[PDB]
Amino acid sequence: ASNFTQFVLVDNGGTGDVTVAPSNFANGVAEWISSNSRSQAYKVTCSVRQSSAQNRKYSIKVEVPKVATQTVGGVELPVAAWRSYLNMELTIPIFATNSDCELIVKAMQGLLKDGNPIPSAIAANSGIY
Amino acid sequence: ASNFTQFVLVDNGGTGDVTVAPSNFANGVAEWISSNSRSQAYKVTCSVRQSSAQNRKYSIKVEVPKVATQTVGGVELPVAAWRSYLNMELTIPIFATNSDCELIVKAMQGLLKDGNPIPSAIAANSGIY
Amino acid sequence: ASNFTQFVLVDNGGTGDVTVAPSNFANGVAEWISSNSRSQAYKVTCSVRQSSAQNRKYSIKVEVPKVATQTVGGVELPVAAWRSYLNMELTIPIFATNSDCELIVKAMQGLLKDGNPIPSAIAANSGIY
Amino acid sequence: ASNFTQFVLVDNGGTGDVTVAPSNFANGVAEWISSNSRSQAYKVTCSVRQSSAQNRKYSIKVEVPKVATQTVGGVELPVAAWRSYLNMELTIPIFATNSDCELIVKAMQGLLKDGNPIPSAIAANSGIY
Amino acid sequence: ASNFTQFVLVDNGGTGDVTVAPSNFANGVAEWISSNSRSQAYKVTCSVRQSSAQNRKYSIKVEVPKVATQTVGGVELPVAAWRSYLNMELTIPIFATNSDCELIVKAMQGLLKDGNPIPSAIAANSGIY
Amino acid sequence: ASNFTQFVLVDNGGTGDVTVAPSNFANGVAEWISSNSRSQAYKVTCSVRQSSAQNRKYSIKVEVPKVATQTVGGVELPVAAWRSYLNMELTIPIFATNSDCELIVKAMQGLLKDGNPIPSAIAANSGIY
RNA sequence: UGAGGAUUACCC
RNA sequence: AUGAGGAUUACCCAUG
RNA sequence: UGAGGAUUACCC
RNA sequence: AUGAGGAUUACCCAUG
């Protein structure tokens, strides 16, 4: 094992899939970046800490760039026009079983599944109504 | 459209699925809960707001019950030993088109996809190694 | 669904029934008013809040007007001679099941049923004795 | 008349009905309790007073036990996890005739009638949406 | 029941119609935004308040963008070249019945009906002459 | 050619229609008043001005009276029991072509079209819910 | 500028 | 939070 | 209140 | 620790 492996972050059906690979584990923050210049790369970071005596907390962050080429000083540089940031924090009691943990993972997958309320609102630039 | 509808939060293949239904809309914050007491319910809330001049931001919260050894309908204390909390914040620059927003949703689904590093660490009560 | 619907507040057997319709949900306070000028309308408001970590509290208010026409400045205005106010607050533990909640609703219905002590005292302008 | 009599608080169709009977009259505050320990009893109290020069006011309180997972006759702590509290205040201007007062009672019954918004939100552990 | 829904702001036959969907109802201010980049979106907000003892006051706001692409340093972004701002306040005494309100609404639709002096001055970059 | 003419403010079929005729165009403020007693008349005013270097700004005002008879000392006079006041400001940058202005006009007519959220809240003495 | 008020081209 | 505290009723009071 | 301004629920 | 607090995103704020 080693769950520190690369995965496809944006599955565009085999063509133009954005895959992210392990790139740093310094300070206990696991990082994954796409194969781009660091200025245009996608980024995922994960870290877990025993926040309380009875909790463990996972901090996950994803950065999705909008790439561009910018003329700075008459010279062109690979750049990100902007970035979208996902910041998630999951707090799990120490009493949670592995099957209890699997229930949390399934709830997060269902939440974001296509056609469900939230992924729909997001993709359409609206709120829930 | 009208996205404020009931959906399957935990998919257990049609039998024993957890469905979550609209339960509150006070202040534009959409809420969905499962058919349980509130101490044992699966809960989801969502809201969008323009956080600043350049960004809009979604606040999505999920509460998941510890199910192993649970007494249905019972009084289970302390509350913290029996619940997991997910808190997601998605910041999106005002320039993101619907297409841009569709890619952000894909990035979120890929991150949580089965077999990928993050949902595997979580499901196995682990960190990255 | 959407439980935010109109209902008959005063059932006068089909003729002169006072029905109340959804009219505002600003600030998370659901409101219903009868089809009258705002000065003569019946009003119902409901709001729920997690008052404690372990309670939820519902605040319900009903205003029953005694309508009149008042000559003010030589001109006649639709007005309410007076108003009767019902203020109710229900505190429910988070541990209460849906069936536990149904028991509370049945107790409130039985309390006010015709012929029972309390609705009798009220309608006769007396106390319990 | 003489309205201080026993009545059915929870109607379960003749079988398993909860009847509440007079239990105290200290200070003109009528009390009715079910046949249980006081920690598990259904309790109702009522009193009228002229709150001010223009109004009379009824204070009606109801305590309902959490029944799911209850141990009959047992010591259940904390007390707050096992009980719901209803507190109603009805303010009525001194000009209200018996007829006016009969309409106020109808407004109260309509509000709590089955299928109407409020008792449906309560029974389903919900707010308005 | 709900009136906080999607609606056609600009009716361009049945194609090129501008639809504005619910986005946020924080602090009694309902907001509606059109789809795609928030930067190029149409925006509508609305709120009511009891301005004084006898008046209720509505505040409606509409923003019509002039869609354009901004190019700076080779990096292009979707922007609104400029925006028009409509601001309206409608004061209504509490004595107005539903019939009075319907008439106020007809007066507003009449003012802006095609061919009438006001909508004709505006559509032509003109004043009254 | 002239747009300072008579027009139907309230279209009530073809009978009971409220027509407002030109009355005064002093100081760049065009005024229109309905017939009969000025005390019970509908009033519409309009003016444009270059609010800033890039903007032109329209100020429109409408008054809908509640017709009534005032009786004081036996002397009765035709009055408006009260009035509703509509006030709108429309800011338009000088870069707007005639086509841009026509779209602004369509957005205004769309907002108030029958059945849409806003004209429906108003005609019903309501807010957004 | 103001989801500031109004006896509504007034006032804060 | 509490009040058989008040109201002109989504406001105010007192106590803690 | 304002035929006060605005980068528009801000400001005067 | 908490925030439908903010960000230029493993940083900052406020409260407790």
Side-chain angles (χ1 to χ4, degrees), chain D residues 73-124:
Chain D
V75 178
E76 299 170 325
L77 279 335
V79 166
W82 291 96
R83 301 187 72 65
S84 299
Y85 304 89
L86 169 70
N87 198 290
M88 290 182 24
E89 289 235 317
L90 184 57
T91 298
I92 309 177
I94 58 165
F95 310 100
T97 68
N98 279 5
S99 289
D100 285 345
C101 290
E102 292 179 15
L103 181 112
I104 293 173
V105 177
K106 285 182 164 301
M108 287 190 273
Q109 298 169 335
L111 176 81
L112 297 164
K113 199 201 185 176
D114 244 16
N116 289 352
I118 314 262
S120 307
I122 297 166

CSV table of all heavy atoms in Angstrom, one decimal, chain D residues 73-124:
chain,number,residue,atom,x,y,z
D,73,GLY,N,-41.3,4.1,34.4
D,73,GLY,CA,-41.1,4.1,35.8
D,73,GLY,C,-39.6,4.3,36.1
D,73,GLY,O,-39.2,4.5,37.3
D,74,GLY,N,-38.8,4.4,35.1
D,74,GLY,CA,-37.3,4.6,35.3
D,74,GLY,C,-36.9,6.0,35.6
D,74,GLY,O,-37.6,6.9,35.5
D,75,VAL,N,-35.6,6.1,36.0
D,75,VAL,CA,-34.9,7.4,36.3
D,75,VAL,C,-34.2,7.7,34.9
D,75,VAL,O,-33.3,7.1,34.5
D,75,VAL,CB,-33.9,7.2,37.4
D,75,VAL,CG1,-33.2,8.5,37.7
D,75,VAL,CG2,-34.7,6.8,38.7
D,76,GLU,N,-34.8,8.7,34.2
D,76,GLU,CA,-34.2,9.2,33.0
D,76,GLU,C,-33.6,10.6,33.0
D,76,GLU,O,-34.3,11.5,33.2
D,76,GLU,CB,-35.3,9.1,31.9
D,76,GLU,CG,-35.8,7.7,31.6
D,76,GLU,CD,-37.0,7.6,30.8
D,76,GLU,OE1,-37.9,8.5,30.8
D,76,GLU,OE2,-37.1,6.7,30.0
D,77,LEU,N,-32.3,10.7,32.9
D,77,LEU,CA,-31.6,11.9,33.0
D,77,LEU,C,-30.7,12.1,31.7
D,77,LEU,O,-30.4,11.1,31.1
D,77,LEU,CB,-30.6,11.9,34.2
D,77,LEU,CG,-31.0,12.2,35.7
D,77,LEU,CD1,-32.2,13.1,35.8
D,77,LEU,CD2,-31.1,11.0,36.4
D,78,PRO,N,-30.5,13.4,31.3
D,78,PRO,CA,-31.0,14.6,31.9
D,78,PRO,C,-32.5,14.8,31.6
D,78,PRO,O,-33.0,14.3,30.6
D,78,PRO,CB,-30.1,15.6,31.3
D,78,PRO,CG,-29.8,15.1,29.9
D,78,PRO,CD,-29.6,13.6,30.2
D,79,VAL,N,-33.2,15.5,32.5
D,79,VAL,CA,-34.6,15.7,32.3
D,79,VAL,C,-34.9,16.4,31.0
D,79,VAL,O,-36.0,16.1,30.4
D,79,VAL,CB,-35.1,16.5,33.6
D,79,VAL,CG1,-36.4,17.1,33.3
D,79,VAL,CG2,-35.1,15.6,34.8
D,80,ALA,N,-34.1,17.3,30.6
D,80,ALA,CA,-34.3,18.1,29.4
D,80,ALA,C,-34.2,17.3,28.0
D,80,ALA,O,-34.7,17.8,27.0
D,80,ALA,CB,-33.3,19.2,29.3
D,81,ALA,N,-33.6,16.1,28.1
D,81,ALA,CA,-33.6,15.3,26.9
D,81,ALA,C,-34.8,14.5,26.7
D,81,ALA,O,-35.1,13.9,25.7
D,81,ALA,CB,-32.4,14.3,27.1
D,82,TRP,N,-35.6,14.4,27.8
D,82,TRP,CA,-36.8,13.6,27.8
D,82,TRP,C,-38.2,14.3,27.8
D,82,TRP,O,-39.2,13.7,28.0
D,82,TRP,CB,-36.7,12.7,29.0
D,82,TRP,CG,-35.7,11.6,28.8
D,82,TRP,CD1,-34.4,11.6,29.3
D,82,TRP,CD2,-35.8,10.4,28.0
D,82,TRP,NE1,-33.7,10.5,28.8
D,82,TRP,CE2,-34.6,9.7,28.1
D,82,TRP,CE3,-36.9,9.8,27.3
D,82,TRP,CZ2,-34.4,8.5,27.5
D,82,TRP,CZ3,-36.6,8.6,26.7
D,82,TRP,CH2,-35.4,8.0,26.8
D,83,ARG,N,-38.2,15.6,27.7
D,83,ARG,CA,-39.4,16.4,27.8
D,83,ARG,C,-39.5,17.6,26.8
D,83,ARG,O,-38.6,18.3,26.6
D,83,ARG,CB,-39.7,16.8,29.2
D,83,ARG,CG,-39.7,15.7,30.1
D,83,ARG,CD,-40.1,16.0,31.5
D,83,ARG,NE,-41.5,16.4,31.7
D,83,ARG,CZ,-42.6,15.6,31.5
D,83,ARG,NH1,-42.4,14.3,31.1
D,83,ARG,NH2,-43.8,16.0,31.8
D,84,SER,N,-40.7,17.8,26.3
D,84,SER,CA,-41.1,18.9,25.4
D,84,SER,C,-42.0,19.8,26.2
D,84,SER,O,-42.7,19.4,27.0
D,84,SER,CB,-41.8,18.5,24.2
D,84,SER,OG,-41.0,17.6,23.5
D,85,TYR,N,-41.8,21.1,26.0
D,85,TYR,CA,-42.6,22.1,26.7
D,85,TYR,C,-43.3,23.0,25.8
D,85,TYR,O,-42.7,23.6,24.9
D,85,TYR,CB,-41.7,22.9,27.6
D,85,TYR,CG,-40.9,22.1,28.6
D,85,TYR,CD1,-39.7,21.6,28.2
D,85,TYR,CD2,-41.4,21.8,29.8
D,85,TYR,CE1,-38.9,20.8,29.1
D,85,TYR,CE2,-40.7,21.0,30.7
D,85,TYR,CZ,-39.4,20.5,30.3
D,85,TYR,OH,-38.7,19.8,31.2
D,86,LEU,N,-44.6,23.1,26.0
D,86,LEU,CA,-45.4,24.0,25.3
D,86,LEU,C,-45.9,25.1,26.2
D,86,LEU,O,-46.3,24.9,27.3
D,86,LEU,CB,-46.7,23.4,24.7
D,86,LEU,CG,-47.6,24.4,24.1
D,86,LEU,CD1,-47.0,25.0,22.9
D,86,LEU,CD2,-49.0,23.8,23.9
D,87,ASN,N,-45.8,26.4,25.7
D,87,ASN,CA,-46.2,27.5,26.5
D,87,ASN,C,-47.0,28.4,25.7
D,87,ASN,O,-46.5,28.9,24.7
D,87,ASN,CB,-44.9,28.2,27.1
D,87,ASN,CG,-45.2,29.1,28.3
D,87,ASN,OD1,-45.8,30.2,28.1
D,87,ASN,ND2,-44.8,28.7,29.5
D,88,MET,N,-48.3,28.6,26.0
D,88,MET,CA,-49.2,29.4,25.2
D,88,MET,C,-49.7,30.6,26.0
D,88,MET,O,-50.1,30.4,27.2
D,88,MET,CB,-50.4,28.6,24.8
D,88,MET,CG,-50.2,27.6,23.8
D,88,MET,SD,-51.9,26.8,23.4
D,88,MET,CE,-53.0,28.0,23.9
D,89,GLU,N,-49.7,31.8,25.4
D,89,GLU,CA,-50.3,32.9,26.1
D,89,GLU,C,-51.3,33.5,25.1
D,89,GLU,O,-51.0,33.8,24.0
D,89,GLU,CB,-49.2,34.0,26.4
D,89,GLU,CG,-48.3,33.5,27.5
D,89,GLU,CD,-48.2,34.5,28.6
D,89,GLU,OE1,-48.1,35.8,28.3
D,89,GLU,OE2,-48.2,34.1,29.8
D,90,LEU,N,-52.5,33.6,25.6
D,90,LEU,CA,-53.6,34.2,24.9
D,90,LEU,C,-54.0,35.5,25.5
D,90,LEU,O,-54.5,35.5,26.7
D,90,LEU,CB,-54.8,33.2,24.8
D,90,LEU,CG,-56.0,33.5,24.0
D,90,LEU,CD1,-55.6,33.7,22.6
D,90,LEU,CD2,-57.0,32.4,24.1
D,91,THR,N,-53.8,36.6,24.8
D,91,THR,CA,-54.2,37.9,25.3
D,91,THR,C,-55.6,38.3,24.6
D,91,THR,O,-55.6,38.2,23.4
D,91,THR,CB,-53.2,39.0,24.9
D,91,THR,OG1,-52.0,38.8,25.5
D,91,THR,CG2,-53.7,40.4,25.4
D,92,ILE,N,-56.6,38.6,25.4
D,92,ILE,CA,-57.9,38.9,24.9
D,92,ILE,C,-58.4,40.3,25.5
D,92,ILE,O,-58.5,40.4,26.7
D,92,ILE,CB,-58.9,37.8,25.3
D,92,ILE,CG1,-58.4,36.4,24.9
D,92,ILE,CG2,-60.2,38.1,24.6
D,92,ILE,CD1,-59.3,35.3,25.3
D,93,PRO,N,-58.7,41.3,24.6
D,93,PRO,CA,-59.1,42.6,25.0
D,93,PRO,C,-60.4,42.4,25.8
D,93,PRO,O,-61.3,41.6,25.4
D,93,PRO,CB,-59.4,43.3,23.7
D,93,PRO,CG,-58.3,42.8,22.9
D,93,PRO,CD,-58.4,41.3,23.1
D,94,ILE,N,-60.7,43.2,26.8
D,94,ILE,CA,-61.9,43.2,27.6
D,94,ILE,C,-63.2,43.4,26.9
D,94,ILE,O,-64.2,43.1,27.4
D,94,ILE,CB,-61.8,44.1,28.8
D,94,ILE,CG1,-61.6,45.5,28.4
D,94,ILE,CG2,-60.7,43.6,29.8
D,94,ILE,CD1,-61.8,46.5,29.4
D,95,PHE,N,-63.1,43.7,25.6
D,95,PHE,CA,-64.3,44.0,24.9
D,95,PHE,C,-64.9,42.7,24.2
D,95,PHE,O,-65.9,42.8,23.6
D,95,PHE,CB,-64.1,45.1,23.8
D,95,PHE,CG,-63.5,46.3,24.4
D,95,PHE,CD1,-62.1,46.5,24.3
D,95,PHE,CD2,-64.2,47.2,25.2
D,95,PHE,CE1,-61.5,47.6,24.9
D,95,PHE,CE2,-63.7,48.3,25.8
D,95,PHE,CZ,-62.3,48.5,25.7
D,96,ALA,N,-64.1,41.7,24.2
D,96,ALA,CA,-64.4,40.4,23.5
D,96,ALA,C,-65.6,39.7,24.1
D,96,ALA,O,-65.6,39.3,25.3
D,96,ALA,CB,-63.3,39.5,23.4
D,97,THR,N,-66.7,39.6,23.3
D,97,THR,CA,-67.9,38.9,23.8
D,97,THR,C,-67.6,37.4,23.7
D,97,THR,O,-66.6,37.0,23.3
D,97,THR,CB,-69.1,39.2,22.9
D,97,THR,OG1,-68.9,38.7,21.6
D,97,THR,CG2,-69.2,40.7,22.8
D,98,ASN,N,-68.6,36.6,24.1
D,98,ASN,CA,-68.5,35.2,24.1
D,98,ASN,C,-68.3,34.7,22.7
D,98,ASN,O,-67.4,33.9,22.4
D,98,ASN,CB,-69.7,34.5,24.7
D,98,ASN,CG,-69.6,34.5,26.2
D,98,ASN,OD1,-68.7,35.0,26.8
D,98,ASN,ND2,-70.5,33.8,26.8
D,99,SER,N,-69.0,35.4,21.8
D,99,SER,CA,-68.9,35.1,20.3
D,99,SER,C,-67.5,35.4,19.8
D,99,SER,O,-67.0,34.6,19.0
D,99,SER,CB,-69.9,35.9,19.6
D,99,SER,OG,-71.2,35.5,19.8
D,100,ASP,N,-66.9,36.5,20.2
D,100,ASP,CA,-65.6,36.8,19.8
D,100,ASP,C,-64.7,35.8,20.3
D,100,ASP,O,-63.9,35.3,19.5
D,100,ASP,CB,-65.2,38.2,20.4
D,100,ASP,CG,-65.9,39.4,19.8
D,100,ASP,OD1,-66.5,39.2,18.7
D,100,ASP,OD2,-65.9,40.5,20.3
D,101,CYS,N,-64.8,35.4,21.5
D,101,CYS,CA,-64.0,34.3,22.2
D,101,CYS,C,-64.2,33.0,21.5
D,101,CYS,O,-63.3,32.2,21.5
D,101,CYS,CB,-64.2,34.3,23.7
D,101,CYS,SG,-63.6,35.7,24.4
D,102,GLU,N,-65.3,32.7,20.9
D,102,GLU,CA,-65.5,31.4,20.3
D,102,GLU,C,-64.8,31.4,18.9
D,102,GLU,O,-64.4,30.3,18.5
D,102,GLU,CB,-67.0,31.2,19.9
D,102,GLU,CG,-67.9,31.0,21.2
D,102,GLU,CD,-69.3,30.9,20.8
D,102,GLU,OE1,-69.6,30.6,19.6
D,102,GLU,OE2,-70.2,31.0,21.7
D,103,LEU,N,-64.6,32.5,18.3
D,103,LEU,CA,-63.9,32.6,17.1
D,103,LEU,C,-62.4,32.5,17.3
D,103,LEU,O,-61.7,32.0,16.4
D,103,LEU,CB,-64.2,33.9,16.4
D,103,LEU,CG,-63.5,34.1,15.1
D,103,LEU,CD1,-64.5,34.1,14.0
D,103,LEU,CD2,-62.7,35.4,15.1
D,104,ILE,N,-61.9,32.9,18.4
D,104,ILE,CA,-60.5,32.9,18.8
D,104,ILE,C,-60.1,31.4,19.0
D,104,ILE,O,-59.1,30.9,18.6
D,104,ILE,CB,-60.2,33.7,20.1
D,104,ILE,CG1,-60.4,35.2,19.8
D,104,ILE,CG2,-58.8,33.5,20.7
D,104,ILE,CD1,-60.3,36.1,20.9
D,105,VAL,N,-61.1,30.6,19.6
D,105,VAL,CA,-60.9,29.2,19.8
D,105,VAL,C,-60.8,28.5,18.5
D,105,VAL,O,-60.0,27.6,18.3
D,105,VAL,CB,-62.0,28.6,20.7
D,105,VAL,CG1,-61.8,27.1,20.9
D,105,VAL,CG2,-61.9,29.3,22.1
D,106,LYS,N,-61.7,28.9,17.5
D,106,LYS,CA,-61.7,28.3,16.2
D,106,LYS,C,-60.4,28.6,15.5
D,106,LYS,O,-59.8,27.7,14.8
D,106,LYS,CB,-62.8,28.8,15.4
D,106,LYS,CG,-64.1,28.3,15.7
D,106,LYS,CD,-65.2,28.9,14.8
D,106,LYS,CE,-66.4,28.1,14.9
D,106,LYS,NZ,-66.2,26.6,14.5
D,107,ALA,N,-59.9,29.8,15.6
D,107,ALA,CA,-58.6,30.2,15.0
D,107,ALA,C,-57.5,29.2,15.6
D,107,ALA,O,-56.6,28.9,14.8
D,107,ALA,CB,-58.3,31.6,15.3
D,108,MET,N,-57.5,28.9,16.8
D,108,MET,CA,-56.6,28.0,17.5
D,108,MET,C,-56.6,26.6,17.0
D,108,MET,O,-55.6,25.9,16.9
D,108,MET,CB,-56.7,28.1,19.0
D,108,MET,CG,-56.2,29.4,19.6
D,108,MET,SD,-56.1,29.3,21.5
D,108,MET,CE,-57.8,29.8,21.8
D,109,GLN,N,-57.9,26.1,16.8
D,109,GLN,CA,-58.1,24.8,16.3
D,109,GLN,C,-57.6,24.6,14.9
D,109,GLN,O,-57.0,23.6,14.5
D,109,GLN,CB,-59.5,24.4,16.5
D,109,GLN,CG,-60.0,24.4,17.9
D,109,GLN,CD,-61.5,24.2,18.1
D,109,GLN,OE1,-62.2,24.6,17.1
D,109,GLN,NE2,-62.0,23.7,19.2
D,110,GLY,N,-58.0,25.6,14.1
D,110,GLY,CA,-57.6,25.6,12.6
D,110,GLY,C,-56.1,25.6,12.5
D,110,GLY,O,-55.6,24.9,11.6
D,111,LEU,N,-55.4,26.4,13.2
D,111,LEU,CA,-53.9,26.5,13.2
D,111,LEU,C,-53.3,25.1,13.4
D,111,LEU,O,-52.4,24.7,12.7
D,111,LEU,CB,-53.4,27.4,14.3
D,111,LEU,CG,-51.9,27.5,14.5
D,111,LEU,CD1,-51.4,28.5,13.5
D,111,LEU,CD2,-51.6,28.0,15.9
D,112,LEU,N,-53.8,24.3,14.4
D,112,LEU,CA,-53.3,23.0,14.7
D,112,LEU,C,-53.9,21.9,14.0
D,112,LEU,O,-53.6,20.7,14.3
D,112,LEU,CB,-53.4,22.8,16.2
D,112,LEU,CG,-52.6,23.8,17.0
D,112,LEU,CD1,-53.0,23.9,18.4
D,112,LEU,CD2,-51.1,23.5,16.8
D,113,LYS,N,-54.9,22.1,13.1
D,113,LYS,CA,-55.5,21.1,12.4
D,113,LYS,C,-54.6,20.2,11.6
D,113,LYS,O,-53.6,20.7,11.1
D,113,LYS,CB,-56.6,21.6,11.6
D,113,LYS,CG,-57.6,20.6,11.2
D,113,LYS,CD,-58.4,20.9,10.0
D,113,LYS,CE,-59.4,19.9,9.7
D,113,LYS,NZ,-60.3,20.3,8.5
D,114,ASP,N,-54.9,19.0,11.5
D,114,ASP,CA,-54.1,18.1,10.7
D,114,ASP,C,-54.0,18.4,9.3
D,114,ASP,O,-55.0,18.7,8.7
D,114,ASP,CB,-54.7,16.7,10.8
D,114,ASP,CG,-53.8,15.7,11.5
D,114,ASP,OD1,-52.8,16.1,12.2
D,114,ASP,OD2,-54.1,14.5,11.3
D,115,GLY,N,-52.8,18.3,8.8
D,115,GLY,CA,-52.6,18.6,7.4
D,115,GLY,C,-52.2,20.1,7.1
D,115,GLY,O,-51.7,20.5,6.1
D,116,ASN,N,-52.4,21.0,8.1
D,116,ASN,CA,-52.1,22.4,8.0
D,116,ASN,C,-50.6,22.5,8.2
D,116,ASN,O,-49.9,21.6,8.8
D,116,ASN,CB,-52.9,23.2,9.0
D,116,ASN,CG,-54.4,23.2,8.5
D,116,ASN,OD1,-54.7,22.8,7.4
D,116,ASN,ND2,-55.2,23.8,9.3
D,117,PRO,N,-50.0,23.6,7.7
D,117,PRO,CA,-48.5,23.8,7.7
D,117,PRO,C,-47.8,23.6,9.1
D,117,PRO,O,-46.8,22.8,9.1
D,117,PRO,CB,-48.4,25.2,7.2
D,117,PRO,CG,-49.4,25.3,6.2
D,117,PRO,CD,-50.6,24.7,6.9
D,118,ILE,N,-48.3,24.3,10.1
D,118,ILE,CA,-47.6,24.2,11.4
D,118,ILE,C,-47.6,22.8,12.1
D,118,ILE,O,-46.5,22.3,12.4
D,118,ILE,CB,-48.3,25.3,12.4
D,118,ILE,CG1,-48.4,26.6,11.6
D,118,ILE,CG2,-47.5,25.4,13.7
D,118,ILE,CD1,-47.4,27.6,11.9
D,119,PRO,N,-48.7,22.1,12.2
D,119,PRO,CA,-48.6,20.8,12.8
D,119,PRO,C,-47.8,19.8,12.0
D,119,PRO,O,-47.3,18.8,12.5
D,119,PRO,CB,-50.0,20.3,13.0
D,119,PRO,CG,-50.8,21.1,12.1
D,119,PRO,CD,-50.2,22.4,12.1
D,120,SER,N,-47.7,20.1,10.7
D,120,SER,CA,-46.9,19.2,9.8
D,120,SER,C,-45.4,19.4,9.9
D,120,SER,O,-44.7,18.5,9.7
D,120,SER,CB,-47.4,19.5,8.3
D,120,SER,OG,-48.8,19.4,8.3
D,121,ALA,N,-45.0,20.6,10.1
D,121,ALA,CA,-43.6,21.0,10.2
D,121,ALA,C,-43.2,20.3,11.5
D,121,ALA,O,-42.3,19.5,11.5
D,121,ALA,CB,-43.5,22.5,10.3
D,122,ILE,N,-43.9,20.6,12.6
D,122,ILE,CA,-43.6,20.0,13.9
D,122,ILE,C,-43.5,18.5,13.9
D,122,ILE,O,-42.5,17.9,14.4
D,122,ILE,CB,-44.6,20.5,15.0
D,122,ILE,CG1,-44.6,22.0,15.1
D,122,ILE,CG2,-44.4,19.7,16.3
D,122,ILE,CD1,-45.7,22.6,15.9
D,123,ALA,N,-44.5,17.8,13.4
D,123,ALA,CA,-44.5,16.3,13.3
D,123,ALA,C,-43.4,15.7,12.5
D,123,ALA,O,-43.0,14.6,12.8
D,123,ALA,CB,-45.9,15.9,12.8
D,124,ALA,N,-42.9,16.5,11.6
D,124,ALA,CA,-41.8,16.0,10.7
D,124,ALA,C,-40.4,16.5,11.1
D,124,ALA,O,-39.5,16.4,10.3
D,124,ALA,CB,-42.1,16.3,9.3
